[PDB]
Motif scaffolding. Structure first.
Motif, PDB file in Angstrom:
ATOM      1  N   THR A   1     -51.948 -14.265  85.520  1.00  0.00           N
ATOM      2  CA  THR A   1     -51.254 -14.310  86.553  1.00  0.00           C
ATOM      3  C   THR A   1     -49.528 -13.946  86.509  1.00  0.00           C
ATOM      4  O   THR A   1     -49.480 -13.760  84.797  1.00  0.00           O
ATOM      5  CB  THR A   1     -50.416 -15.521  87.365  1.00  0.00           C
ATOM      6  OG1 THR A   1     -50.781 -16.890  86.712  1.00  0.00           O
ATOM      7  CG2 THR A   1     -52.719 -15.551  88.206  1.00  0.00           C
ATOM      8  N   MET A   2     -49.156 -14.018  86.762  1.00  0.00           N
ATOM      9  CA  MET A   2     -46.792 -13.186  86.363  1.00  0.00           C
ATOM     10  C   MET A   2     -46.869 -14.692  86.274  1.00  0.00           C
ATOM     11  O   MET A   2     -46.268 -15.247  84.958  1.00  0.00           O
ATOM     12  CB  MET A   2     -46.426 -13.148  87.495  1.00  0.00           C
ATOM     13  CG  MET A   2     -44.733 -12.849  87.193  1.00  0.00           C
ATOM     14  SD  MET A   2     -44.921 -11.895  85.631  1.00  0.00           S
ATOM     15  CE  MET A   2     -44.169 -10.301  85.453  1.00  0.00           C
ATOM     16  N   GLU A   3     -47.043 -15.816  86.083  1.00  0.00           N
ATOM     17  CA  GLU A   3     -46.250 -17.260  86.175  1.00  0.00           C
ATOM     18  C   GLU A   3     -47.622 -17.448  84.674  1.00  0.00           C
ATOM     19  O   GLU A   3     -46.971 -18.354  84.167  1.00  0.00           O
ATOM     20  CB  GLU A   3     -47.420 -18.203  86.564  1.00  0.00           C
ATOM     21  CG  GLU A   3     -45.750 -19.455  87.854  1.00  0.00           C
ATOM     22  CD  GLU A   3     -46.843 -20.622  88.138  1.00  0.00           C
ATOM     23  OE1 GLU A   3     -47.485 -20.509  89.231  1.00  0.00           O
ATOM     24  OE2 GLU A   3     -45.979 -22.200  87.185  1.00  0.00           O
ATOM     25  N   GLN A   4     -48.758 -17.208  83.573  1.00  0.00           N
ATOM     26  CA  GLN A   4     -48.772 -17.493  83.359  1.00  0.00           C
ATOM     27  C   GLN A   4     -48.325 -16.726  82.168  1.00  0.00           C
ATOM     28  O   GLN A   4     -48.664 -16.957  80.603  1.00  0.00           O
ATOM     29  CB  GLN A   4     -50.959 -17.176  83.670  1.00  0.00           C
ATOM     30  CG  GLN A   4     -51.853 -18.362  84.062  1.00  0.00           C
ATOM     31  CD  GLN A   4     -52.804 -17.402  84.183  1.00  0.00           C
ATOM     32  OE1 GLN A   4     -52.967 -16.642  84.701  1.00  0.00           O
ATOM     33  NE2 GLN A   4     -53.768 -19.388  84.397  1.00  0.00           N
TER      34      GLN A   4
ATOM     35  N   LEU B   1     -45.963 -15.472  81.433  1.00  0.00           N
ATOM     36  CA  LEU B   1     -44.280 -15.934  81.687  1.00  0.00           C
ATOM     37  C   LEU B   1     -43.822 -16.946  80.153  1.00  0.00           C
ATOM     38  O   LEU B   1     -43.450 -16.876  79.564  1.00  0.00           O
ATOM     39  CB  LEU B   1     -42.936 -16.602  83.300  1.00  0.00           C
ATOM     40  CG  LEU B   1     -43.065 -15.409  83.577  1.00  0.00           C
ATOM     41  CD1 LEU B   1     -42.401 -15.410  84.978  1.00  0.00           C
ATOM     42  CD2 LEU B   1     -42.135 -14.347  82.656  1.00  0.00           C
ATOM     43  N   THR B   2     -45.529 -17.838  81.109  1.00  0.00           N
ATOM     44  CA  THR B   2     -45.270 -19.205  80.240  1.00  0.00           C
ATOM     45  C   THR B   2     -45.924 -18.590  78.606  1.00  0.00           C
ATOM     46  O   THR B   2     -45.861 -19.218  77.639  1.00  0.00           O
ATOM     47  CB  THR B   2     -45.916 -20.064  80.429  1.00  0.00           C
ATOM     48  OG1 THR B   2     -45.942 -20.781  81.618  1.00  0.00           O
ATOM     49  CG2 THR B   2     -46.737 -20.823  79.725  1.00  0.00           C
TER      50      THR B   2
END
Length: 124
Positions: free
Chosen positions: A2-5, A7-8
Motif C-alpha cells: 500500500t501507499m502507507e507501507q 512510505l514506511t
C-alpha cells in the motif's frame, strides 16, 4: 504494497544503507523528496547504489537491469506509482552507459528517474 507501507519502507531501506557511509541529513532529505539538484558526494552516490542493490535493479557494477526492474516493481512501489515508475525505467534504461564507475552509474540513473518523474518521486 500500500501507499502507507511504501512510505514506511523508505525508512527501512535507508536504515540498511545509511550506516555504511558518511552522509549529511540535509542531502538525504533532499533525495527523499526527489530533489537531486545539488552536487553529490561519492558517499551519497554509493548510498544510491546500496539502495538499488537492495531493490535488485542494478548489479555490483552499477548496471541497471531494465527487465528485472520491471519485474521487481510490484515489490518496490505501490499501485499509484507503477505507471510513473514504468515510464521512468524506460526513459532511464540507458543512462548508465554514459558513466563507468558503479556508484556514479546508479546515482545518475536515480537522478534520471527523479527528473523524468511526471509526478512526485521519493528516494529512500
Amino acid at each position: 504494497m500500500t501507499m502507507e507501507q511504501f512510505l514506511t519502507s523508505l525508512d527501512m531501506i535507508r536504515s540498511g544503507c545509511a550506516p555504511k557511509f558518511k552522509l549529511k541529513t540535509e542531502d538525504l532529505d533532499r533525495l527523499r523528496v526527489g530533489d537531486f539538484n545539488f552536487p553529490p558526494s561519492q558517499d551519497l552516490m554509493c548510498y544510491t547504489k546500496c539502495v538499488s542493490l537492495m531493490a535488485g535493479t542494478v548489479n555490483k557494477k552499477g548496471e541497471f537491469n531494465a527487465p528485472k526492474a520491471l519485474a521487481q516493481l510490484p515489490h518496490l512501489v505501490p499501485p499509484e506509482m507503477m505507471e510513473m515508475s514504468r515510464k521512468s525505467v524506460e526513459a532511464c534504461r540507458d543512462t548508465h552507459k554514459q558513466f563507468k564507475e558503479s556508484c556514479e552509474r546508479v546515482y545518475q540513473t536515480a537522478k534520471c528517474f527523479s527528473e523524468n518523474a511526471d509526478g512526485q518521486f521519493m528516494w529512500p
